[PDB]
A paper describes a structure:
Three capsid types have been recognized from the nuclei of herpesvirus-infected cells: empty A-capsids, scaffolding-containing B-capsids, and DNA-filled C-capsids. A unique portal vertex exists at a 12th I5 vertex through which the genome is translocated during assembly. Here, portal proteins assemble into a dodecameric basket-like structure that is thought to seed the assembly of scaffolding proteins, in turn driving the formation of spherical procapsids composed of MCP, SCP, and triplexes. A separate protein complex, the terminase, associates with the dodecameric portal and initiates genome packaging and the concurrent autoproteolytic cleavage of the scaffold.
To improve the resolution of the portal baskets, we carried out separate sub-particle reconstructions and refined them while imposing C12 symmetry, leading to portal basket structures at resolutions of 3.6, 3.5, and 3.7 Å for the A-, B-, and C-capsids, respectively. Additionally, an “anchoring” segment of the scaffold protein is resolved interacting with the portal baskets of A- and B-capsids but not D- and C-capsids. The C12 reconstruction of both A- and B-capsid portal baskets revealed a small hook-like density with large aromatic side chains and sharp turns wedged into a hydrophobic pocket between the crown domains of each portal monomer. This density is weaker in A-capsids, but still conspicuous, whereas it is completely absent in C-capsids, D-capsids, and mature virions. Indeed, we found the scaffolding protein residues 449–455 (PYYPGEA, numbered relative to pUL26) to be a good fit for the small density. Based on our model, P452 interacts with the essential residues W127 and L131 (both adjacent to W90) from the first portal monomer, whereas Y451 forms a hydrophobic interface with Y83 and Y608 from the second portal monomer. Furthermore, E454 from the scaffolding appears to stabilize Y608 via hydrogen bonding, buttressing the hydrophobic interactions between the three aromatic residues. Sequence alignment of scaffolding and portal proteins showed that Y608 and Y83 are highly conserved across herpesviruses, suggesting this motif is essential for portal-scaffold association. A- and B-capsids varied in portal height by ~2 and ~1 nm, respectively, could rotate up to 13 degrees relative to the capsid shell, and exhibited up to 1 nm of portal basket “sway,” due to flexibility between the clip and nearby wing and stem domains. In addition to scaffold-capsid interactions, our structure shows high-resolution details of the scaffold-portal interface, enabling the first atomic model of a portion of the scaffolding protein and revealing its tightly packed, hydrophobic nature nestled between portal monomers (G and K through M).
Residue numbers in the entry:
A (entry chain a), B (entry chain b): 24 to 27, 29 to 310, 494 to 623
Write the structure that this text describes.
């Protein structure tokens, strides 16, 4: 009644089998390994966790902890000045600055350790299990559709967060850390539930239906009988008894088929020229391969015969396909290629817009995550975890408070 | 009832035999030797041990040890100033700074020696024996599955740790070293147990079963009858009476087979042209190789004959295959190639993302290790043991305490 099959047709399995390399392989197709990398999503998760944890800092409690540390050390400005009994301002100012610097560095490394501990719970479950990123990317590359299945339930990520947070000694050790953790807690649990709930379907099991007259999708899972919802990013085109997607493989499909047919024909022609000598026969009027035209003759004669051993060549077509594959995959997914002074492709990573165009829709619709803050740039992908934490730490709120307290302490260390 | 053989099929053994150069060898395939190196895991172990050992340092106890050293030397500020009896601040400050510098240098040397001694117990057992890394890498390269066998037991690593730790003179000599070792001890034992328990199955023994309907794995060891736990990073595809993996060898498989067949056909054609002259015979109407076609002639005649000694060429295919192998292995495993001003491939090592994508899951799942701290950078793989220890020593907790003590001593050496 207007419905039609979409995904499980063989003309769609052919696309995936092409993607696995069942129709030849090229150097250009090897760029696709970078496109599937889960580095961008892990960097985004690390940045989001760091922002959420460091945003809950407060000046009052951190100053209280600093005053408690000063009281523990017994190095108040009154006692220090009454002990030193000298007017050398530079020396005592440097002493106070170093005393503050030690505490600042220890607090920074403690916060780094806690942040890495928090990050460690999410990262492994991203690329594998429920809500897998490379599966999302290959869904996009093959069809442009991403079927998604949802169930509201708890599991590994939530249990991991509950086990990690509820007995970590740093919360008891530092009031500021515990306050920030309890303030930013609910967001972490909501993000964990978002990670757990969704699950992108598998390419060999799911069923997808399309009804042109209204333009809605019905996607079902035949094993469990579970109804899902279909996400569309680059909508297809319906031309009667057909349906043409606009995925990169669909655009690249005819060229590689033609090249494959050319290579097969060249192989067939190659196997023909094994024998060096050939013989031709015919009726009389009244290492070797022998041709017999004796039977078909009747009142005729062999007027003339020719030989021309053609062999098609296919190297130029393979070079063209390699370059075409590379250019298509670079321009479609916004891949930024780093280069040397003259050496080519020293490293490959996502561009600044590629993550905004691909990673952000993942977090926003595929996972339905609560928030991820301001997106990172295309240069923070290259940075390591420690470099990223240092980058976010300097520009965020906490550094301003830390530089604020030091100035006042250096000031009043000698005025009083 | 739906179960299918997966690994012991011949089409899987062919992949490993291809990996061992049974279908020809190329210069590009030689990059795979770097991919199997156990350098990254040893660097990660060294970094983890250094972080664990240095993070347990306590300011109070090392200050007490320094005060004990000062008491032993009899070089307290009171005695030193009362002996020198001069107002030359620069000389006395330099003397005190050198006195502290000798102690800090010898403490650094002692800590380095102890850290190397602790590291020496783990490193040999990594690449070989239980929990071998190159076997894991070639498991990933062949199929993408990593069957793993587990059994909780005590073994050589734990006995080595027990023999090394319980009678080391450094613990009795220094209170700081003993306290840090006692505090960090349980983690070392847990890591040793993690190293002992796991064992990656051998490629020529294990059995792997896959049931598409439900999608779970049953992996068994036929010799001991021990059931294992299967891991998957790059899930395969099921296309009816098949199973298509997405390992690099699977993607590269058709091309190398075509090249091998071309080379074999070229050899066969080459062996044919060894005779310079050829003779063709036929019935009369009413160093040499001679062809007899007179038997099949019957009321016929030889109308025409041809010769064309074809010899296929295969050098271009070999060069293309070498380049394809190299590019595939570079892009799939995220290999960073160092280069000269113009010279190519001065040295080859893991990139910053390669260790996070491959070394980190090994520790997380294959070993089930407790913790490894912050991951290292791809630039730290190049560094040696002493360089890595010095790198982790400067930015860790102990340096702040050591610099704090020096400034306070330099100040109080003359104000009192």
């Amino acid at each position: 009644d207007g419905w039609v099959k979409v995904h499980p047709t063989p003309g769609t399995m052919l696309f995936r089998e092409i993607l696995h390399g069942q129709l030849g392989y090229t150097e250009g197709q090897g760029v696709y390994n970078v496109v599937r990398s889960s580095e961008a999503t892990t960097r985004q998760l690390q940045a989001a966790i760091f922002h959420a944890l460091l945003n809950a800092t407060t000046y009052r409690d951190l100053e209280a902890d600093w005053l408690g540390h000063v009281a523990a050390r017994g190095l108040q400005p009154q006692r220090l000045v009454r002990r030193y009994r000298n007017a050398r301002e530079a020396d005592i100012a440097g002493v106070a600055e170093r005393v503050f610097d030690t505490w600042r560095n220890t607090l920074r490394t403690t916060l780094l350790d806690f942040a890495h501990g928090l990050v460690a719970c999410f990262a492994p479950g991203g690329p594998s299990g429920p809500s897998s990123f490379p599966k999302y990317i290959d869904w996009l590359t093959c069809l442009g559709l991403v079927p998604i299945l949802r169930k509201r339930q708890e599991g590994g990520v939530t249990q991991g967060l509950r086990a990690f947070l509820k007995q970590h000694p740093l919360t008891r050790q530092l009031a500021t850390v515990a306050e920030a953790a309890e303030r930013a807690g609910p967001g972490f649990f909501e993000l964990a539930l978002a990670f757990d709930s969704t699950r992108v379907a598998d390419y060999d099991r799911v069923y997808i239906y399309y009804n042109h007259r209204r333009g809605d999708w019905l996607v079902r899972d035949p094993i469990s009988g579970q109804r899902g919802e279909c996400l569309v990013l680059w909508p297809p085109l319906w031309t009667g008894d057909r349906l043409v997607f606009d995925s990169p493989v669909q655009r690249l499909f005819p060229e590689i088929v033609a090249c494959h047919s050319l290579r097969e024909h060249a192989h067939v022609c190659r196997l023909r020229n094994t024998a060096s000598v050939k013989v031709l026969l015919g009726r009389k009027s009244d290492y070797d391969i022998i041709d017999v035209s004796k039977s078909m003759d009747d009142d005729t004669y062999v007027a003339n015969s020719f030989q021309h051993p053609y062999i098609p060549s296919y190297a130029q077509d393979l070079e063209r396909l390699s370059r075409l594959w590379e250019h298509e995959l670079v321009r479609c997914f916004k891949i930024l290629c780093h280069r040397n002074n003259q050496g080519q492709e020293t490293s490959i990573s996502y561009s600044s817009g590629a993550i905004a165009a691909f990673v952000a829709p993942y977090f926003e619709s595929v996972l339905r995550a609560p928030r991820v803050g301001a997106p990172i740039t295309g240069s923070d992908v290259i940075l390591g975890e420690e470099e990223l934490w240092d980058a976010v730490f300097k520009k965020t709120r906490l550094q301003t408070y830390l530089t604020d307290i030091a100035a006042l302490f250096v000031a009043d260390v000698q005025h009083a």
